[PDB]
């Protein structure tokens, strides 16, 4: 009981639900037809989490792909596990948006989203007891950063009480392939942090930096990241699907690292991770994977969580561990970084125990912090913004469908309220 | 004829009674799936459903159905009864207003007609056994349900709760000290006797006495068990000098305000090293109040003591338990207080304890579980007050539970309380 | 004008020696402490 | 030992009739050519096919049905066809010259000596047929030949047999799309006619199943055949309880007790469910509780009449498969607690289930997929008067200045019919209407 719903939106979020749900596949053993062929009892035991029952016995992940242009989810059709998916809940309008937040959330936007809101709303009322929901978008992209946030605001009018989850890919200014993704990320978090209940942001160039730095082969790939990120969306609910010490859910989570309702954005990592050619020499014990774990480099985030103070922090460990370690370890990490971590919140770190390691891995960790780091990431965003701003400067794009520049000034005093409340607490003392 | 009813609810309620479970069974000697192989103590526990196996007397409550799945899916599914096993849909997720109003006023209708149709069929019934971790949203809201409910449902029945509070420093969630001052408003004024039963305490002793470098949450449990069965003991085994579970409230409680106790056991010893020494009672008593084996962090050294209830298994003999306490009497650290000239109950079982298979334990004649309730318990209080107030001065994490029916002013007579209490301790420890 | 590393690194060979579970949980090793009993003696409760 | 007889008069109810006894053979397991392929011996105790076929003796078997057309084209064809084995040649009644679209045609100048030899037919039928549960009978309205010749066979059988029930499965015209011009004059005719002689009425309209096809079958060029195979199915759907097991075994007599309220009042529409091809057919749940429900949803009616403008006084639902009955009923309160269909105060408890314990069969290169579970629904609604108001205007907006009058009255038709015709429809609508308010 207590299961999800997925639902993608965009080029970007598509391309991670397709390796997400091959990933899943994988653990739980289902060949590409929706047949079982697992070999552990434990396999099957909480299939209802992501899977829906057929007729003749197969399974159908419960995920409803909805974008404007048919390319991508005639793309995704064809690939490996994409039979999985169910025809009809495939949505795909006819004209396209061309990376503009007016016409993915104004115009095309309103007339589309009733098949996907009906189809949602069917699934959601088929389950027993729902959980909550969990979408995977980027913020640099018109059509996703805008219908997303829309059937956000639409699905919170719905089911005020359940918990929606979000993977957001915000726009680095370092790598950018976008030149207006200022004005879409924006108007997209404005929305954004005013509805969702959890939000985490991954960014490009840190997956690059991971991808070199510490796995360290030659071609990182799309399909890498897209992996890496999907092993990191996995190990949330690992601990929902499979028996442990402690059990947390996605709720659990939520009132273990949200102190205020607006600071709901969160950096995330997993460990362990080494070369091809060092996977001998290593030795997995929990003070290697905890040192891996709140190493820098191995953030999903450019952002440096040593420029800031760690408001909390939670870390899901999988396999057969003992507990006593663990809790001395998170002590002695607590106490020799007493400087970085808030002072006015006394053992700001839960820990959590699940007894199923991944596919073929002895132990694995999948932290999540909610730390005031992340500042940099809005600050400069809204420079870029602002500097695009003055100028007026690709402005009449939007403009001229509907949208006028009092929601964008809305917006940007919205933002910059969000930071400078946001750093109030990074120099709060007790 | 004399039986007792126990409550489990919650993660850690579950997991400790688990372990329980199968060292009643193994002691008494019920196979896994309810049957005797080859006089009627188990009355105690169990009773007769007619012909053949026996029911263990127990309920299982959990909001979160994951482990309450694997206990039916595990080798003891054909021992407990399948709707005993009382199972939600969503776990109360750490928030004490989820448990207490929100959602399990829909289980507690439930639990109290099981507690009907199982009190029915007892005759004798000496009371109620419950346990719980209290930094659990669901395990602190739905015992303090419970516990007021049955309180006013059969009135001056005793109660005893077993509860496993945070540590000083280790501990796992965020916001467990708002849960758990809490639940020490709710049953405060409604449980009888209390038990101090953090886990870092057991850490440490199994960490110098067994050397396990590693321990999990089994032997913790394990410990927890044997602690019950040497308490319990006492009713289902013939023994020099018995005592019952009602003479509790009537030896241990100075003060209706006074009844939180924490214990001590001895002793808890490896399988080869012990076995080059007598283990003599002497030396077993003394480490019984030797205070780094005391299953709390509190320093009984930084206050007095009110009152101390000792039971021994084994063939042990009353002279020496009483040249024990002449010594323990004799000896300066331990200092008692002025009112309470003898403060000493003893209680003597020729039953030994027995051992699980495949344990940490060894088996050896004899065994002597200890009691106490000083004035030094406050302490715990007084560090859960101030981490309390650190995050209750900027209103972190209120709003959640303000959005979920809680009033805003709910945590200042709880802080009142716990005020109050401490200052009670204070009072009880002056000299006259 | 690429090994077996192409993501699938996260878990990959690991033979099973590895796989069993760390060294011991919840028992000790030291021989001046371990938990197994004298072979011919197996069974007698040893105190005085 | 219990039998029905059929007749397909006109090129549609051929065209249906075609259809039908293609499913009906499969079903059954007989070959086209007509033989048993053995293996079904061993004393056989069941005459499963008594109901639509009857042995010859030794090997084939012949169905209790007659083909009735005066265009040679489509009965030679037939003649020729596959099937060409299989039916008694001399019962496919075959005329010389086409009725040309006018009912004076087929009712008054050439249907005399079609009719006296369709009639010594079904005496011959009906003397070896010895338990005889009724006629189904089988044609279009919008044309010549099949109003006026299915008139006239049922006043002539109704005055031979009498009480028999008879079961018309007739095509009336769609709304805006049709074929011919002419076809209200004959429609209105046709309906006078049956009004008074047919039992039970089902609407078959063509636009309806056209929809239904490009919805779920998702087919955007369908033809006649598909429309044929999904009445065909309807039709076996109905038919299977007479000659299958059954929890609750239903006879064709439970329709002229249990759908019609009022003598006058015989007119239904039905409906039919799941339609899922066979690629999305593993990916879905077809449950009871969603097959039921989206029987009763608007856009799956049979006929273009929209059931939200009206009232519901009696459904009959069959289900067929490995359903159960207590999720039938489950399913069934939930419809009553479910607020958009609404029935009549008068009729408190409206429902009749019957239960088939055959899962239908799939015919090769068909469309449908296979299923375990399926539901046919048969409903009597006051919604229905609004496609005769719509015929009554079609009717007398182009017959207020005499169009195409003379074409019927230089045959031999007396020019008062239309007026009287005109008379009875009103007075039908008029109780329709009458029967709609609140006690
Ligand atoms: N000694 C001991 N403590 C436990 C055990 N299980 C959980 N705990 C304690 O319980 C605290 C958290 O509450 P849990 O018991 O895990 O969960 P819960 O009581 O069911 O409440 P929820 O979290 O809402 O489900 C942890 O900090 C542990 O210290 C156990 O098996 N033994
Ligand atoms: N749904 C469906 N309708 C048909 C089919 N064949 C004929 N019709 C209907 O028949 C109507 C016209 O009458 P026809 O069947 O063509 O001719 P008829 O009934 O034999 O009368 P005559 O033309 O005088 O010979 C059309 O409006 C169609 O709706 C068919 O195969 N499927
Ligand atoms: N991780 C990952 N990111 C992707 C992929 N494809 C696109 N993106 C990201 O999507 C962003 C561009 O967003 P866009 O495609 O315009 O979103 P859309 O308008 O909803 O289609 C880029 O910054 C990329 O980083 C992918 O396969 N994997
Ligand atoms: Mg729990
Ligand atoms: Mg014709």
């Not at chain 1, 947390?248 to 091809?276: C, Q, W």
């Not at chain 1, 971590?341 to 891995?361: Q, R």
């Not at chain 2, 289980?107 to 346990?131: M, P, S």
Request: hydrophobic letters at 35%; glycine letters at 8%.
């Amino acid at each position: 009981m207590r299961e999800i719903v997925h639902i993608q939106g965009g080029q970007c979020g598509n391309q991670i639900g397709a390796k997400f749900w091959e990933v899943i596949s994988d653990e739980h053993g289902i060949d590409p037809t929706g047949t079982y062929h697992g070999d552990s009892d434990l396999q099957l035991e909480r299939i209802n989490v992501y899977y829906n029952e057929a007729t003749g016995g197969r399974y159908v992940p419960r995920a409803i792909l909805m974008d404007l242009e048919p390319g991508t989810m005639d793309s995704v059709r064809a690939g490996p596990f994409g039979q999985l998916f169910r025809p009809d809940n495939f949505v795909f309008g006819q004209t396209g948006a061309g990376n503009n937040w007016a016409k993915g959330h104004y115009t095309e936007g309103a007339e589309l989203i009733d098949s996907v809101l009906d189809v949602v709303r069917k699934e959601a009322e088929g389950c027993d007891c729902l959980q909550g929901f969990q979408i995977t978008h980027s913020l640099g992209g018109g059509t996703g950063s805008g219908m997303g946030t829309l059937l956000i605001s639409k699905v919170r009018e719905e089911y005020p009480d359940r918990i929606m989850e979000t993977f957001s890919v915000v726009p680095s200014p370092k790598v950018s392939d976008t030149v207006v993704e200022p004005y879409n990320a924006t108007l997209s978090v404005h929305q954004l942090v005013e509805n969702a209940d959890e939000c985490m942001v991954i960014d490009n160039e840190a997956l690059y930096d991971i991808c070199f730095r510490t796995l360290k082969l030659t071609t990182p790939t799309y399909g890498d990241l897209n992996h890496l990120v999907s092993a990191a969306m996995s190990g949330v609910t690992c601990c929902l699907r499979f028996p442990g010490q402690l059990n947390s859910d996605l709720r659990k989570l939520a009132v273990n690292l949200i102190p205020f309702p607006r600071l709901h954005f969160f950096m995330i990592g997993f460990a362990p991770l080494t070369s091809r050619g060092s996977q001998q020499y290593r030795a997995l014990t929990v003070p290697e994977l905890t040192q891996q774990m709140f190493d820098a480099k191995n953030m999903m985030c450019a952002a440096d969580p040593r420029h800031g103070r760690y408001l909390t922090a939670s870390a899901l460990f999988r396999g057969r561990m003992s507990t006593k370690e663990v809790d001395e370890q998170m002590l002695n990490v607590q106490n020799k970084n007493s400087s970085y971590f808030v002072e006015w919140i006394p053992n700001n770190i839960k820990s959590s125990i699940c007894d199923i390691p991944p596919k073929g891995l002895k132990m694995a960790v999948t932290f999540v912090g909610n730390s005031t780091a992340i500042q940099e990431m809005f600050k400069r965003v809204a420079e870029q913004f602002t500097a695009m701003f003055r100028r007026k400067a690709f402005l009449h794009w939007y403009t001229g469908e509907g949208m006028d520049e009092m929601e964008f000034t809305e917006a940007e005093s919205n933002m910059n309220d969000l930071v400078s409340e946001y750093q109030q607490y990074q120099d709060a003392t007790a | 004829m004399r039986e007792v009813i126990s409550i489990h609810v919650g993660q850690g309620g579950i997991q400790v009674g688990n372990a329980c479970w199968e060292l009643f069974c193994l002691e008494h000697g019920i196979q896994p799936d309810g049957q005797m192989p080859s006089d009627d103590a188990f009355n105690t526990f169990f009773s007769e459903t007619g012909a053949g196996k026996h029911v263990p007397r127990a309920v299982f409550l959990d909001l979160e159905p994951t482990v309450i799945d694997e206990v039916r899916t595990g080798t003891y599914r054909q021992l407990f009864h399948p709707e005993q096993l009382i199972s939600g849909k969503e776990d109360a997720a750490n928030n004490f207003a989820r448990g207490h109003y929100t959602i399990g006023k829909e289980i507690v209708d439930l639990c109290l007609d099981r507690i009907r149709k199982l009190a029915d069929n007892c005759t004798g019934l000496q009371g109620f056994l419950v346990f719980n971790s209290v930094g659990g949203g669901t395990g602190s809201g739905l015992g303090s349900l419970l516990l007021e409910r049955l309180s006013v449902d059969y009135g001056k029945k005793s109660k005893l709760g077993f509860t496993i509070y945070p540590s000083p420093q280790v501990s796992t969630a965020v916001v467990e000290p708002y849960n758990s001052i809490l639940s020490t408003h709710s049953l405060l004024e409604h449980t009888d006797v209390a038990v101090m039963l953090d886990n870092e305490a057991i850490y440490d002793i199994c960490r110098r006495n067994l050397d396990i470098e590693r321990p999990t949450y089994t032997n913790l449990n394990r410990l927890i068990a044997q602690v019950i069965s040497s308490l319990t003991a006492s009713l289902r085994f013939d023994g020099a000098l018995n005592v019952d579970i009602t003479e509790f409230q009537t030896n241990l409680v100075p003060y209706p305000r006074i009844h939180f106790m924490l214990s001590s056991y001895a002793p808890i010893i490896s399988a080869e090293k012990a076995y080059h020494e007598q283990l003599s009672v002497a030396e077993i008593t003394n480490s019984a109040f030797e205070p780094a084996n005391m299953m709390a962090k509190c320093d009984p050294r930084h206050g007095k003591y009110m009152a101390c209830s000792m039971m021994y298994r084994g063939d042990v003999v009353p002279k020496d338990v009483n040249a024990s306490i002449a010594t323990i009497k004799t000896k300066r650290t331990i200092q008692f207080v002025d009112w309470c000239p003898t403060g000493f109950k003893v209680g003597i079982n020729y039953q030994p304890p027995t051992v699980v298979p495949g344990g940490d334990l060894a088996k050896v004649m004899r065994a002597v579980c200890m009691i106490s309730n000083s004035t030094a318990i406050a302490e715990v209080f007084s560090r859960l007050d101030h981490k309390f107030d650190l995050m209750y001065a900027k209103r972190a994490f209120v709003h959640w539970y303000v959005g979920e029916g809680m009033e805003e002013g709910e945590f200042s007579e709880a802080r009142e309380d716990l005020a109050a209490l401490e200052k009670d301790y204070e009072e009880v420890g002056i000299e006259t | 004008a690429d090994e077996w590393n192409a993501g699938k690194c996260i878990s990959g060979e690991a033979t099973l020696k590895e796989v069993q579970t760390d060294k011991d949980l919840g028992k000790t090793n030291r021989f001046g402490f371990r938990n197994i009993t004298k072979d011919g003696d197996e069974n007698r409760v040893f105190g005085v």
